[PDB]
Amino acid sequence: SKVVVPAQGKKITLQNGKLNVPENPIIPYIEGDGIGVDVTPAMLKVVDAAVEKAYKGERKISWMEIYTGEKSTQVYGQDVWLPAETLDLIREYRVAIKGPLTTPVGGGIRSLNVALRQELDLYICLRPVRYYQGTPSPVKHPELTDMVIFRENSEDIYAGIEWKADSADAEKVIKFLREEMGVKKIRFPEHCGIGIKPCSEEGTKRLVRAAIEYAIANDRDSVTLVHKGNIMKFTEGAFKDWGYQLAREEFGGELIDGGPWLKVKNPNTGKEIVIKDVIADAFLQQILLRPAEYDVIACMNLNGDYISDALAAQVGGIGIAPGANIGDECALFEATHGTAPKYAGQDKVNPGSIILSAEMMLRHMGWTEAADLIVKGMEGAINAKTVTYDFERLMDGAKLLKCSEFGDAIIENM
Amino acid sequence: SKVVVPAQGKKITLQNGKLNVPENPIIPYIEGDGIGVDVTPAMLKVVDAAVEKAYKGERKISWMEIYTGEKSTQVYGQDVWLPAETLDLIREYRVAIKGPLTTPVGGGIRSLNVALRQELDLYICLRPVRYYQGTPSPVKHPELTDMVIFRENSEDIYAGIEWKADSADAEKVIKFLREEMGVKKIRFPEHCGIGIKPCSEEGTKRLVRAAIEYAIANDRDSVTLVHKGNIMKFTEGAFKDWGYQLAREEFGGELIDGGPWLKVKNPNTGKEIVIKDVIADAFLQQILLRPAEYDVIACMNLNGDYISDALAAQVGGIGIAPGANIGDECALFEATHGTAPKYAGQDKVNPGSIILSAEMMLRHMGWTEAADLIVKGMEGAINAKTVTYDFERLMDGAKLLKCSEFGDAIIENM
């Protein structure tokens, strides 16, 4: 209604499980609040340059701006933080990309990022972390990290089912838990907030199936289920058992020695994919001490949030970490950092996260060549030490570039 | 009943908030399963040697063995994993120390470590992590880490309130949540496990008060509340607000600029202690990228579990990390690693965690001199590169010692 759909351009189509991408697809993008005003222009420019270079003018993206966050209230009115048509348009055009979003406080509004994922049922949050040679890192061997995270997006504590301490609601569930359920283990029932953590079988098997399928398609070495099941047995422990069960029932997993680890034979390359599990808190140690042991990771919503952030700091990537939210009917690629309002408009932050989520975008569309051109550009600009302030502070011998100029440095290195 | 209380020795006494430690106190110790059979002998010997050296024979601990875990079933019968008298004896003698515990699967038994903390209401899990010069680390600057973790022990998801998917119980709470509470946000209500996360005001203020008091007593620079309150508002977000409120109402905190950070004036040294907060997943990044910015940490049960493990890997300490569980009536010091059954009885693992929790033990008893002798011994043995297999693999020029011999190396360096 306030979005202008491009005169030229065609919708991507879902022809049962498969995308049918035209040569001039329309892609919805949400600019983002804060530094989204700096990073999104940079990404629109390097994606245009890479599809221009790969396909010699034969292909072109017709970018269509849609609204969420603070910019949505300036277009549609002070109270509409998430217009209903953003959800219809992402559904409709199948793939979109977004910058960082501001969720406000004071207004009872929950995370607009979790709202998009739940509302569109984008149950996979895919976070790949690899090291780009030459980025400053706090660890001695960042090059040993190349993992791909499959974090469940629709359930867990992250779903937002919770009640305030002293509310009538919380009082009512606490009464139901103590009286009807007989729980004796709430230490202080008065002035007590209560949160609900759900974990279902369909919820964990649709995520784990995607993780093993990803490992077969890209012949990765292993899928590691990480969970805190020795303490949360019926949610996190259920997730590890349902995960193992799916690798046995649908991928023909077999015990290695006397378990619990399984072997899945990659029907394409013939190699064995170890399916294993590790408790989440020892895993937060293993990624620092033994990162080469791990590769595809499957976990619940909260743990995946912690694992992705911890990994991304290790490979010097807090500002170049890409991410995607994939459901069955559409996909939403995104800058994984926040809006950083201090720097907003100054053209200085790293455009690296949203540029690398755009290469994940291009790859999902089957435009593999344009996507390989962006990572070639990325590795060249970083290797050239022609870098943005966050990388330059930690480097010696680096040239400092603005956000838009690092965009150009990626195109020069293509 | 099967414990032999020492002929010599006197109980420590609680004379309202203060311990009155005799010269020959009786200390309960639980040996632990697995490698507890290797580490506990090493610790009994270096603590004896340090109180012998500090007080020249004037003082002596009368060690009294008590039982939990696998060893308890061999003393009291196959079914008693936690005898009721262990709880009475820890209560009674006030301070105890323990090795690693085996909790069994198949028997519906929840964590024996969480059972001791809940049953004795030891609401503080105190985890100090500092770097000992010369221990191998995966990070470039381990020496910038010196933090003290105050993890809440009695509430959160870690309390164990949960129901199995498809049980009558879970079905009943899911029906109550959808029908009576009107929750529309459980994506898959069928075959769904459910866990409860409680956070109360008394629960978070007794923990945070201990954290600020610790920072005043040891003139630390700051107390950082870490929480995931932007998504769990009424449990994790309640914890940050109740924390800030307590620093204002009881420690006379004042805004720095326009908040939200507070300043507390240390009534003893006159210095200002910054009270601040950071979201838990950006904090998992900040500890790797900016560790010198942080010092006393206060957090809920699960996050403290992750933060302690992540920190302890960074300072090369997965096998030398000390820990304590402190309530108002007693305290239980402990080896923070697991039972490692593979190595059990071979005398090779690092005795470092239980030895450093024994120095925390000695310090709590007011036996400061004996405790300073143990850390002097520790730093000397590590610096001497006269080290155990876990440190030696990662070092060049190290002598490899068995577990008992590293005990002797700590005494030699005293």
Side-chain angles (χ1 to χ4, degrees), chain A residues 1-7 9-14 17 19-78 80-179 181-183 185-189 191-201 203-256 258-270 272-328 330-341 343-414, chain B residues 1-7 9-14 17 19-78 80-179 181-183 185-189 191-201 203-256 258-270 272-328 330-341 343-414:
Chain A
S1 181
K2 219 138 308 87
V3 318
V4 178
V5 17
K10 231 99 131 164
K11 301 202 229 265
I12 296 180
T13 263
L14 222 315
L19 290 171
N20 182 215
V21 183
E23 306 188 352
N24 188 197
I26 295 163
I27 305 297
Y29 75 95
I30 295 150
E31 181 168 37
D33 303 320
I35 50 175
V37 85
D38 298 303
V39 296
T40 293
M43 173 287 280
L44 290 182
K45 173 182 64 194
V46 331
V47 170
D48 280 3
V51 325
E52 174 84 288
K53 198 199 173 107
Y55 304 116
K56 299 188 180 164
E58 295 303 307
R59 278 131 96 156
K60 194 172 203 283
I61 292 160
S62 277
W63 297 107
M64 182 178 63
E65 187 170 10
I66 53 165
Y67 309 98
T68 300
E70 165 59 32
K71 191 151 171 193
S72 175
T73 63
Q74 287 302 305
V75 161
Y76 299 114
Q78 237 97 216
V80 26
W81 285 93
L82 173 49
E85 74 174 321
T86 290
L87 299 168
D88 298 336
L89 260 1
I90 294 174
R91 232 114 68 186
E92 201 182 310
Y93 287 81
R94 309 280 149 175
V95 5
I97 189 165
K98 66 166 207 52
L101 265 35
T102 295
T103 314
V105 325
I109 303 164
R110 293 191 177 272
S111 178
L112 289 180
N113 293 336
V114 170
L116 289 170
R117 311 200 258 227
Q118 289 176 358
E119 228 63 91
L120 292 162
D121 203 37
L122 310 169
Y123 64 90
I124 299 162
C125 172
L126 177 61
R127 303 292 185 93
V129 357
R130 74 144 176 122
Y131 181 64
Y132 284 72
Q133 207 54 59
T135 71
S137 174
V139 305
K140 322 281 191 51
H141 290 299
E143 71 283 338
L144 292 184
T145 296
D146 181 324
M147 294 176 217
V148 184
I149 316 299
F150 277 78
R151 164 198 182 185
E152 197 303 310
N153 259 349
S154 68
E155 0 185 81
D156 206 355
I157 199 70
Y158 239 88
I161 306 168
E162 54 164 1
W163 302 276
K164 278 196 91 172
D166 294 310
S167 69
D169 289 321
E171 233 100 82
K172 187 175 178 179
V173 323
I174 292 179
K175 173 95 101 56
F176 172 80
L177 292 171
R178 303 219 285 136
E179 272 158 38
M181 297 315 304
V183 317
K185 208 127 264 153
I186 301 176
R187 174 71 261 253
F188 292 121
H191 317 293
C192 188
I194 296 287
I196 304 300
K197 176 192 180 86
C199 180
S200 69
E201 176 181 38
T204 128
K205 289 205 249 248
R206 54 180 191 167
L207 175 99
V208 183
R209 184 183 297 127
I212 300 176
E213 279 173 356
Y214 177 94
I216 287 168
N218 300 280
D219 30 308
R220 301 300 305 223
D221 309 275
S222 54
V223 175
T224 298
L225 286 10
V226 340
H227 61 91
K228 189 61 189 163
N230 58 330
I231 299 298
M232 294 123 252
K233 294 170 170 171
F234 305 135
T235 57
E236 298 274 329
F239 181 86
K240 157 240 170 70
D241 286 334
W242 285 323
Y244 271 119
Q245 179 177 56
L246 180 117
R248 275 189 279 126
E249 295 184 348
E250 302 188 15
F251 290 84
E254 274 166 35
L255 287 188
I256 294 180
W261 299 3
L262 270 20
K263 247 171 191 288
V264 165
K265 221 197 91 297
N266 190 319
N268 308 331
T269 69
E272 274 162 336
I273 300 165
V274 174
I275 310 298
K276 45 177 191 190
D277 74 285
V278 12
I279 302 284
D281 55 356
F283 182 75
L284 246 21
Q285 309 182 314
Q286 290 303 105
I287 58 178
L288 217 41
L289 274 20
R290 258 147 78 185
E293 220 92 288
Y294 303 95
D295 173 342
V296 186
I297 308 295
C299 49
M300 293 177 64
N301 212 329
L302 182 85
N303 284 332
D305 180 43
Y306 289 2
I307 305 310
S308 314
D309 275 22
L311 248 356
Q314 165 170 335
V315 302
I318 43 177
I320 59 167
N325 303 286
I326 303 154
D328 295 330
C330 54
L332 177 71
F333 298 89
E334 68 172 0
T336 63
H337 57 76
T339 68
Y343 301 124
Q346 288 163 47
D347 193 30
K348 50 125 70 55
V349 291
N350 199 334
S353 167
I354 204 194
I355 286 174
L356 256 23
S357 307
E359 91 69 67
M360 285 177 86
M361 182 175 72
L362 253 26
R363 203 170 290 282
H364 180 82
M365 282 160 77
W367 293 13
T368 276
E369 294 86 352
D372 290 332
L373 244 48
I374 293 181
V375 357
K376 182 205 178 176
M378 251 296 161
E379 301 172 332
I382 283 172
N383 218 261
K385 314 216 281 180
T386 237
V387 117
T388 172
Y389 86 99
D390 57 300
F391 279 6
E392 190 269 324
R393 305 149 150 150
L394 306 174
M395 285 168 123
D396 282 327
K399 182 173 69 165
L400 168 77
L401 284 43
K402 305 184 93 180
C403 179
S404 59
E405 304 172 327
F406 187 64
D408 297 355
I410 290 157
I411 297 167
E412 290 161 11
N413 282 271
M414 281 188 190
Chain B
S1 181
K2 219 138 308 87
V3 318
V4 178
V5 17
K10 231 99 131 164
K11 301 202 229 265
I12 296 180
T13 263
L14 222 315
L19 290 171
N20 182 215
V21 183
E23 306 188 352
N24 188 197
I26 295 163
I27 305 297
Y29 75 95
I30 295 150
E31 181 168 37
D33 303 320
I35 50 175
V37 85
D38 298 303
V39 296
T40 293
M43 173 287 280
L44 290 182
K45 173 182 64 194
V46 331
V47 170
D48 280 3
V51 325
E52 174 84 288
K53 198 199 173 107
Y55 304 116
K56 299 188 180 164
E58 295 303 307
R59 278 131 96 156
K60 194 172 203 283
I61 292 160
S62 277
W63 297 107
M64 182 178 63
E65 187 170 10
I66 53 165
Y67 309 98
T68 300
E70 165 59 32
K71 191 151 171 193
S72 175
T73 63
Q74 287 302 305
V75 161
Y76 299 114
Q78 237 97 216
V80 26
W81 285 93
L82 173 49
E85 74 174 321
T86 290
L87 299 168
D88 298 336
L89 260 1
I90 294 174
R91 232 114 68 186
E92 201 182 310
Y93 287 81
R94 309 280 149 175
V95 5
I97 189 165
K98 66 166 207 52
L101 265 35
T102 295
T103 314
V105 325
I109 303 164
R110 293 191 177 272
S111 178
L112 289 180
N113 293 336
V114 170
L116 289 170
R117 311 200 258 227
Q118 289 176 358
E119 228 63 91
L120 292 162
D121 203 37
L122 310 169
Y123 64 90
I124 299 162
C125 172
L126 177 61
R127 303 292 185 93
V129 357
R130 74 144 176 122
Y131 181 64
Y132 284 72
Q133 207 54 59
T135 71
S137 174
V139 305
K140 322 281 191 51
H141 290 299
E143 71 283 338
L144 292 184
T145 296
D146 181 324
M147 294 176 217
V148 184
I149 316 299
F150 277 78
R151 164 198 182 185
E152 197 303 310
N153 259 349
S154 68
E155 0 185 81
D156 206 355
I157 199 70
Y158 239 88
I161 306 168
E162 54 164 1
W163 302 276
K164 278 196 91 172
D166 294 310
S167 69
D169 289 321
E171 233 100 82
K172 187 175 178 179
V173 323
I174 292 179
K175 173 95 101 56
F176 172 80
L177 292 171
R178 303 219 285 136
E179 272 158 38
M181 297 315 304
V183 317
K185 208 127 264 153
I186 301 176
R187 174 71 261 253
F188 292 121
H191 317 293
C192 188
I194 296 287
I196 304 300
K197 176 192 180 86
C199 180
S200 69
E201 176 181 38
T204 128
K205 289 205 249 248
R206 54 180 191 167
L207 175 99
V208 183
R209 184 183 297 127
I212 300 176
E213 279 173 356
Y214 177 94
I216 287 168
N218 300 280
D219 30 308
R220 301 300 305 223
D221 309 275
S222 54
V223 175
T224 298
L225 286 10
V226 340
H227 61 91
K228 189 61 189 163
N230 58 330
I231 299 298
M232 294 123 252
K233 294 170 170 171
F234 305 135
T235 57
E236 298 274 329
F239 181 86
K240 157 240 170 70
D241 286 334
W242 285 323
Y244 271 119
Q245 179 177 56
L246 180 117
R248 275 189 279 126
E249 295 184 348
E250 302 188 15
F251 290 84
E254 274 166 35
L255 287 188
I256 294 180
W261 299 3
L262 270 20
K263 247 171 191 288
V264 165
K265 221 197 91 297
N266 190 319
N268 308 331
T269 70
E272 274 162 336
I273 300 165
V274 174
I275 310 298
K276 45 177 191 190
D277 74 285
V278 12
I279 302 284
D281 55 356
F283 182 75
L284 246 21
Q285 309 182 314
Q286 290 303 105
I287 58 178
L288 217 41
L289 274 20
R290 258 147 78 185
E293 220 92 288
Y294 303 95
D295 173 342
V296 186
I297 308 295
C299 49
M300 293 177 64
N301 212 329
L302 182 85
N303 284 332
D305 180 43
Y306 289 2
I307 305 310
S308 314
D309 275 22
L311 248 356
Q314 165 170 335
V315 302
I318 43 177
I320 59 167
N325 303 286
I326 303 154
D328 295 330
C330 54
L332 177 71
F333 298 89
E334 68 172 0
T336 63
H337 57 76
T339 68
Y343 301 124
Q346 288 163 47
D347 193 30
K348 50 125 70 55
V349 291
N350 199 334
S353 167
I354 204 194
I355 286 174
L356 256 23
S357 307
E359 91 69 67
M360 285 177 86
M361 182 175 72
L362 253 26
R363 203 170 290 282
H364 180 82
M365 282 160 77
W367 293 13
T368 276
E369 294 86 352
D372 290 332
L373 244 48
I374 293 181
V375 357
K376 182 205 178 176
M378 251 296 161
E379 301 172 332
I382 283 172
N383 218 261
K385 314 216 281 180
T386 237
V387 117
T388 172
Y389 86 99
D390 57 300
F391 279 6
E392 190 269 324
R393 305 149 150 150
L394 306 174
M395 285 168 123
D396 282 327
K399 182 173 69 165
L400 168 77
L401 284 43
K402 305 184 93 180
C403 179
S404 59
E405 304 172 327
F406 187 64
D408 297 355
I410 290 157
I411 297 167
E412 290 161 11
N413 282 271
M414 281 188 190

